[PDB]
Amino acid sequence: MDLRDIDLNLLVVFNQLLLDRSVSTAGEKTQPAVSNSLKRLRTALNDDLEPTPYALHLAEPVIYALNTLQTALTTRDSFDPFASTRTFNLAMTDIGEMYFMPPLMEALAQRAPHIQISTLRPNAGNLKEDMESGAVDLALGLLPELQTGFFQRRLFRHRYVCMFRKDHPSAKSPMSLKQFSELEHVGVVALNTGHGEVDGLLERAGIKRRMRLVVPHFIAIGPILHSTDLIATVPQRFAVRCEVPFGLTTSPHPAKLPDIAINLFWHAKYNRDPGNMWLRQLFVELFSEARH
Amino acid sequence: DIDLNLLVVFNQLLLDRSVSTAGEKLGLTQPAVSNSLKRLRTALNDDLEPTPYALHLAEPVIYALNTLQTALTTRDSFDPFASTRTFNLAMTDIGEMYFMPPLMEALAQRAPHIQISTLRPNAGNLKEDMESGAVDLALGLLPELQTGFFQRRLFRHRYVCMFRKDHPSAKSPMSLKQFSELEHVGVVALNTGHGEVDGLLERAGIKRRMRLVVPHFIAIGPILHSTDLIATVPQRFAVRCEVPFGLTTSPHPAKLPDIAINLFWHAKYNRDPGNMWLRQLFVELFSE
Amino acid sequence: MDLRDIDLNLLVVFNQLLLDRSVSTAGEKTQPAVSNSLKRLRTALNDDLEPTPYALHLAEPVIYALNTLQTALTTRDSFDPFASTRTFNLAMTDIGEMYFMPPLMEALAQRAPHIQISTLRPNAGNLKEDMESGAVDLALGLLPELQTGFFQRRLFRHRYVCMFRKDHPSAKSPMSLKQFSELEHVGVVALNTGHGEVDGLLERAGIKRRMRLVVPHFIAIGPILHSTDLIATVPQRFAVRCEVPFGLTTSPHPAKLPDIAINLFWHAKYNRDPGNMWLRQLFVELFSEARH
Amino acid sequence: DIDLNLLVVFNQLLLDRSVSTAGEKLGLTQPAVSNSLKRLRTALNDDLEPTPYALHLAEPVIYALNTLQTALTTRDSFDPFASTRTFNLAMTDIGEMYFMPPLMEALAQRAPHIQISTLRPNAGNLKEDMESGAVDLALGLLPELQTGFFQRRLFRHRYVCMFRKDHPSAKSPMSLKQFSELEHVGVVALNTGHGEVDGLLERAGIKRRMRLVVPHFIAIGPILHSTDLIATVPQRFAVRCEVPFGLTTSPHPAKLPDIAINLFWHAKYNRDPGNMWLRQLFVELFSE
């Protein structure tokens, strides 16, 4: 079929036939080189192109089809954030979501209005294989399982802090270890995260706590602290998200706890993928505290 | 006038109709349980894991041994002022966010020394752990729990549209046309009642520009606060979010079904003072 | 536990303790036989039963529990349709459903108000195994695959007829073969049913048909015939269901077609199951044309 | 100015990137297709089933070869008065019942010699058979069809409650209380849009005495006619049922989402005169 339509370079001259005439110039754009090829376009196609109906039926659909090969001039190395309609999938924890997503979406509103963002927890499917396959573009957090086929970039470190409602009858900042051990706590187990070791670190330090409430995740901590005299041990970025909205106060933690490293992860296979690079750089711009 | 002790043997000739056999649990030797089985087949005129009409009789007699055992066994006393007991409650993140703050506020004045621990509904498995007492109460939409579970509807979730106050476009009440013009945050919420919403809107032919999709509800407040995105959320989540994050709601322009949030407890703990006390507290605080 | 509660025949005497006193008579219902056993009921249970609180806590829950063993007096051979809350599962075709279900539900409204009926097509799961397991109580139709472990009872035979709208411009009853072959048809493939052989029987008889429309099932036939000049070859029971509602006329079929046998099927395992027997007999009563 | 014939080869170096290889379909020998592949890798400076940035270029060039081939290939003429062509349409039983009578009535006056054949949506598979032309049009709620399928919403199903006219209790409009008092017929309708209804009512906490459950809609009319049962049905089924079976409807007291019924056709037949004619007929008859 198309092998019988043969040379389509003659369809590039049919672009000069999609433009009307300009023929000696369209040759010079030569006229004898055109003449045989267009005559051959006609030996291939009965119509004398002198504009003919079916010639108009060929003129425009040729252009778009020819143009997409020229629209292809933008290489794979090209990526236009302001026009992209691509979806990016990002792995992060609930805290990661709560912290990263609002300023990201805020920035994306201007820089990439037409893209879509989807998030997931680092345990939805299998993170490694999904990132290698391109199902997940980036991951955020500690993630010690991401090693061989993965690059990583440090975004920031944040400590655990103690949080409680601002008009607490007795809680003070900076909080003493004594008061910490006398007040009542709401704790997050946070299974399979970096935050699970906290209870062990405290107990192995001889720091007893009256655990009035234990929840598996962070969603309710803000409202709980707001309406009770409980206090909580939480990551500082979470505390940052919660302080003003729930009328909460934080304090440097009276206990010795390690800080948490939050890194940006991507697979080696996409180290040079333009869209991935762009989003990566946006994350670095918004959240990296290197030059602080 | 046929002896009843053999009937006592029957219920474990049912649980261990699996013929492992029961006698080891009974404390009686298998020959004695076989003599007992002879007394059974004789008194019933039926040879009973081959199960006959004894299957038909098993449930009337299971209904018999149940009430007799409960009325005989003494139950654990419960003093709310003094109790140091830990209650384990199964609920969703929405459920946690809505229930826990007013509950804990209430527990501070009614039962100062008890401990509460919450968990996600699936998968303990929940029915098993509620049978064993590992989980005391369950909350929300849980279809699996019918046989052996008492239930009670606390309330009905109604869906609304949530956005920030000073949103340049969004109005209340919002049109269905404006709803499809604006940009949305999606909450997957897999395997919960709220995980159906996107599907419902899809099947209704409601076109929706999905700018952001998250699996859960934790970031919705902050996200709406800092963007012009709109969300489809349960009303009570919205009431938990409005003031802290500076958001308003509109009645949802699309026809969405309400979702009944119920309270569940296993039949084995229907008479347990502590369980009764806590679940009555849930009814007092949250039922409409 | 209950082995320590020992003799519960003493709970049957505790039924005479659930009734209040009547003691010499409750003995005669003897008094010394009672006396040691009730004294022993007391050596087992501290309370002096003289009505005591916990004695009242024992009185009623004992009765219901004792009564269910006496409520058990109704044997497996017993089945009360007027009080049953049992669900019956019935396998049948769409035509079978359309024909059987309305007079059945009509009859059930008085005879078994509290039972539930569910239906399914003879190809939902695997019919044989589901009927042997009790997942399906009865099946209705031809069903030649139901042989070894199954009993069957003939309900009726019905022929194929020709159906068309009552004010058809030309269609007549009784219809001639000529007119049948000249008019236009809507046909039902009815895959994996007894009705699929029809087209083959007609074609192998040299009867050409102008098939204007072919549908896989019967749901639309009535409305289609009502609004068109098409005619259809359909089972007569279907025609019975459709004639008046859709303003249709039927005619004895001009072509030689075999009639269809509709039988009632149940598994041997449930030949004597009282509820099954009852429903079976209700089907025989409502639909059997033996003594016609 | 790089030659285009190699680009023609590329699209089958894509379909047969599976490297079976394409050349057998091409009619060219594999050595010539390998020389062609050398011209490819040379002109593109990229070594392309290992697929590189040529994957990025494959779709712009698939977008290229598509329009060029369609505009070149002559299409089949269609004369509705004379056409003897058979159209295969995929739809549900509800869809069949609603669409077929007014369609056939219309076809009797517009295209007397064509033949129509309907089938159930799953599983041809539908997308495959619509690609091959075995199935011409699809109708209803079909989520699978997005890539390579043009679609258009005909209308929206709204759920109502149906019962017989002289029903001793049922009123219009029906209360939600009366809805839970009366007895119901259930339609499973597995894997259709309407198979969700029971689940929606369940999750809303709408108690429903389910006296009868059937898998499909064929018997609902006759059943309602001869009993005091009520049903939850799409409005158009109800309008097909009211007069023949002596039934009325009430607005559904429960909040149920509408269900968009769309019309689907494969992109490969978007320019086909007959397909265009029939689907335009569907739009003329049924779109609201």
What the block records as the tokens of D2 is: 């790089």
**CA dist list (Å): A110 to A114, B220, C289:** 10, 20, 79
What the block records as the tokens of B235 is: 């009303």
Give the closest residue to B264 by CA, choosing from B144, B123, B171: B144
Give the closest residue to B2 by CA, choosing from B65, B63, B58, B45: B45
Question: Does the beta-carbon distance from B214 to A124 stay under 8 Å?
Answer: no
Contact C71, B64 (CB under 8 A): no
What the block records as the tokens of C178 is: 């000529």
Round to whole Å and give the CA distance between A117 and A92. Answer: 13
Residue B213, SS3? Answer: strand
Q: Which CATH class is domain C156-260?
A: alpha beta
Residue D91, SS3? Answer: coil
Chain C contact for B60 (CB, 8 A cutoff): yes
Question: Does the beta-carbon distance from B68 to C62 stay under 8 Å?
Answer: yes
User: In chain A, which residue's Cα lies nearest the Cα of B85?
Assistant: A212
Q: Are strands C184-188 and A260-267 parallel, antiparallel or unpaired?
A: unpaired
Residues 6 or more apart whose Cβ sits within 8 Å of residue C261: C142, C154, C156, C157
Round to whole Å and give the CA distance between C19 and C49. Answer: 11
Burial of A172 from C-beta contacts in 10 A (0-12 / 13-18 / 19+): exposed
Contact D114, D84 (CB under 8 A): yes
Round to whole Å and give the CA distance between B104 and B111. Answer: 10
**Exposure string for B8-46, b = 16+ CB within 10 A, e = fewer:** bbbbbbbebbeeebbbeebebeeeebeebbeebeeebee
Cβ neighbours around A121 below 10 Å, total: 18
Residue B7, SS3? Answer: helix
SS (H, E, C) A100-148: HHHHHHHHHHHHCCCCEEEEECCCCCCHHHHHHHCCCCEEEECCCCCCC
Contact B273, B76 (CB under 8 A): yes
Please report the DSSP string for D141-165 in residue order: --TT--TTEEEEEEEEE-EEEEEET
As a whole number of Å, the CA-based R_g of chain B is: 26
Contact C140, C260 (CB under 8 A): no
Round to whole Å and give the CA distance between B254 and B199. Answer: 13
Give the closest residue to B56 by CA, choosing from D24, A223, C74: C74
Contact C155, C288 (CB under 8 A): yes
Contact A176, A221 (CB under 8 A): no
Which of B110, B113, B218, B236 is the best residue to mutate to test the A interface, defined by the most A CB atoms within 10 Å of its own CB? B218
The three-point CA angle D9-D10-D14 to 5° equals: 120
Give the closest residue to C262 by CA, choosing from C232, C292, C284: C284
The DSSP code for B81 is T
Residue A91, SS3? Answer: strand
Residues 6 or more apart whose Cβ sits within 8 Å of residue B96: A215, A217, A219, A220, B118
Chains that touch C (3 or more CB pairs under 8 A): B, D
Contacts of B141 in chain D (CB under 8 A): 203
Residue C88 φ/ψ region, left for φ over 0, alpha for ψ in the -120 to 50 degree band, beta for the rest = beta
Residue C6 φ/ψ region, left for φ over 0, alpha for ψ in the -120 to 50 degree band, beta for the rest = left
Residue A66, SS3? Answer: helix
Round to whole Å and give the CA distance between D153 and D144. Answer: 15
Residue type, A127: L
Question: Does the beta-carbon distance from A120 to B215 stay under 8 Å?
Answer: yes
What the block records as the tokens of C197 is: 């052989």
Tell me the β-bridge partners of C261: C157
Of A12, A68, A75, the CB nearest to D63: A68
Residue D43, SS3? Answer: helix
User: In chain D, which residue's Cα lies nearest the Cα of A62?
Assistant: D68
Question: Does the beta-carbon distance from D70 to A58 stay under 8 Å?
Answer: no
User: In chain B, which residue's Cα lies nearest the Cα of D257?
Assistant: B255
Question: Does the beta-carbon distance from B65 to C61 stay under 8 Å?
Answer: no
Of B60, B66, B70, the CB nearest to C69: B60
The three-point CA angle D74-D75-D80 to 5° equals: 145
Chain D contact for C170 (CB, 8 A cutoff): no
Which of D139, D144, D156, D255 is the best residue to mutate to test the B interface, defined by the most B CB atoms within 10 Å of its own CB? D255
Which of C90, C170, C184, C219 is the best residue to mutate to test the D interface, defined by the most D CB atoms within 10 Å of its own CB? C219
Chain D contact for B255 (CB, 8 A cutoff): yes
Experimental method of this PDB entry: X-ray
User: In chain D, which residue's Cα lies nearest the Cα of C214?
Assistant: D117
Q: How many residues in total does chain A contain?
A: 292
Round to whole Å and give the CA distance between C33 and C39. Answer: 10
Round to whole Å and give the CA distance between B188 and B197. Answer: 9
The rounded Cα D115 to chain-centroid distance in angstroms is: 19
Which of B91, B104, B107, B241 is the best residue to mutate to test the A interface, defined by the most A CB atoms within 10 Å of its own CB? B104
Which of B85, B91, B94, B96 is the best residue to mutate to test the A interface, defined by the most A CB atoms within 10 Å of its own CB? B96
- Count chain C–chain D contacts defined by CB atoms under 8 A: 115
Round to whole Å and give the CA distance between C163 and B272. Answer: 68
What the block records as the tokens of A202 is: 């405290």
Of A186, A224, A241, the CB nearest to B222: A241
**CA dist list (Å): C202 to C163, C170, C173, C257:** 16, 22, 19, 8
Chain D from 202 to 231: CB within 8 A of any B CB: 202-205
Residues 6 or more apart whose Cβ sits within 8 Å of residue D207: D180
Question: Does the beta-carbon distance from D57 to A65 stay under 8 Å?
Answer: no
Of C106, C213, C222, the CB nearest to D226: C106
Round to whole Å and give the CA distance between B117 and B133. Answer: 13
**CA dist list (Å): B173 to A10, A247, B177, B253:** 59, 30, 12, 8
Q: Are strands B137-140 and B259-266 parallel, antiparallel or unpaired?
A: antiparallel
Round to whole Å and give the CA distance between C278 and B239. Answer: 56
Round to whole Å and give the CA distance between B261 and B155. Answer: 5
The DSSP code for B146 is -
Round to whole Å and give the CA distance between C7 and C37. Answer: 9
Tell me the β-bridge partners of A250: A163
Round to whole Å and give the CA distance between D260 and B203. Answer: 6
User: In chain A, which residue's Cα lies nearest the Cα of D2?
Assistant: A9
Question: Does the beta-carbon distance from B259 to D156 stay under 8 Å?
Answer: no
Of A5, A64, A76, the CB nearest to D72: A5
Cβ neighbours around D208 below 10 Å, total: 17
| Widest pairwise Cα distance in chain A | 98
Residue B23, SS3? Answer: helix
Please report the DSSP string for chain C in residue order: -TTTS--SHHHHHTTTTTS---HHHHHH--HHHHHHHHHHHHHHS-S-----HHHHHHHHHHHHHHHHHHGGGS-TT---TTT---EEEEE--HHHHHHHHHHHHHHHHHH-TT-EEEEE-TTSS-HHHHHHHTS--EEEE--TT--TTEEEEEEEEE-EEEEEETT-SS--SSPPHHHHHHSEEEEE--TTSGGGGHHHHHHTTT---EEEEEESSSTTHHHHHHHSS-BEEEEHHHHHHHHHHHTEEEEE-SS----EEEEEEEEGGGTT-HHHHHHHHHHHHHH--TT-
Question: Does the beta-carbon distance from C7 to B4 stay under 8 Å?
Answer: yes
Give the closest residue to C98 by CA, choosing from C222, C265, C228: C222
Question: Does the beta-carbon distance from D255 to B260 stay under 8 Å?
Answer: no
Burial of C244 from C-beta contacts in 10 A (0-12 / 13-18 / 19+): exposed
Residue D60, SS3? Answer: helix
Of B214, B219, B240, the CB nearest to A223: B240
Round to whole Å and give the CA distance between C284 and C140. Answer: 12
User: In chain D, which residue's Cα lies nearest the Cα of C243?
Assistant: D244
Round to whole Å and give the CA distance between C9 and C16. Answer: 11
Round to whole Å and give the CA distance between D281 and D75. Answer: 20
Round to whole Å and give the CA distance between A90 and A282. Answer: 13
Round to whole Å and give the CA distance between D243 and A245. Answer: 60
Round to whole Å and give the CA distance between A147 and A267. Answer: 10
Burial of D146 from C-beta contacts in 10 A (0-12 / 13-18 / 19+): exposed
- Helices of type H across chain D: 5-15, 23-26, 30-44, 54-72, 93-110, 126-132, 176-181, 197-203, 220-226, 235-245, 273-286
Task: Find tokens 């089907």 and name the residue.
Answer: C283
**Exposure string for D147-176, b = 16+ CB within 10 A, e = fewer:** eebeeeebbebbbbbbbbeebeebeeebee
Contact D4, A7 (CB under 8 A): yes
Task: Find tokens 């672009």 and name the residue.
Answer: A15
Give the closest residue to D61 by CA, choosing from A7, A67, A5, A11: A67
Burial of C281 from C-beta contacts in 10 A (0-12 / 13-18 / 19+): exposed
The fold for domain B157-259 equals: D-Maltodextrin-Binding Protein; domain 2 (3.40.190)
Contact D228, C109 (CB under 8 A): yes
Chain A from 83 to 122: CB within 8 A of any B CB: 94, 97-98, 101-103, 105-106, 109, 116-121
> How many CA atoms are closer than 13 Å to the CA of B85, on its beta-carbon side?
23
Round to whole Å and give the CA distance between A44 and A41. Answer: 5
Of A7, A69, A76, the CB nearest to D64: A69
Round to whole Å and give the CA distance between A68 and D65. Answer: 10
Round to whole Å and give the CA distance between B94 and B154. Answer: 14
CA distance D51 to chain C (A): 44
Cβ neighbours around A83 below 10 Å, total: 10
Q: Where are the beta strands (DSSP E) in B47-148?
A: 86-90, 115-119, 137-140
Round to whole Å and give the CA distance between C216 and C93. Answer: 13
CA distance B94 to chain D (A): 16
- Helices of type H across chain A: 9-13, 23-28, 31-44, 53-70, 94-111, 127-133, 177-182, 198-203, 221-227, 236-246, 274-287
Query: Phi, psi (5° rounding) for residue D173?
Result: -75, 145
Q: Are strands C210-215 and C184-188 parallel, antiparallel or unpaired?
A: parallel
Cβ neighbours around B259 below 10 Å, total: 22
Of C1, C57, C68, the CB nearest to B60: C68
The DSSP code for A231 is B
SS3 content of chain B, % helix, strand, coil (to 5): 45, 20, 35
CA distance D213 to chain B (A): 19
Round to whole Å and give the CA distance between A95 and A92. Answer: 8
Round to whole Å and give the CA distance between A70 and A274. Answer: 20
Enter the CATH code of domain B4-72.
1.10.10.10
Chain D contact for B200 (CB, 8 A cutoff): yes
Chain D contact for B257 (CB, 8 A cutoff): yes
Residues 6 or more apart whose Cβ sits within 8 Å of residue B73: C1
Which of C184, C213, C225, C242 is the best residue to mutate to test the D interface, defined by the most D CB atoms within 10 Å of its own CB? C213
Round to whole Å and give the CA distance between D274 and D75. Answer: 10
Contact B114, B164 (CB under 8 A): no
Query: Phi, psi (5° rounding) for residue B19?
Result: 40, 55
Query: Phi, psi (5° rounding) for residue D64?
Result: -80, -55
Residue type, A14: F
- Count chain A–chain D contacts defined by CB atoms under 8 A: 64
Round to whole Å and give the CA distance between D194 and B53. Answer: 40
Of C11, C12, C69, the CB nearest to B61: C69
Query: Phi, psi (5° rounding) for residue A112?
Result: -145, 80
Burial of B148 from C-beta contacts in 10 A (0-12 / 13-18 / 19+): exposed
DSSP H or E stretch at residue D137: strand D137-140
Give the closest residue to B154 by CA, choosing from B137, B169, B167: B137
Q: Are strands B159-164 and B115-119 parallel, antiparallel or unpaired?
A: unpaired
What the block records as the tokens of B239 is: 């009431």
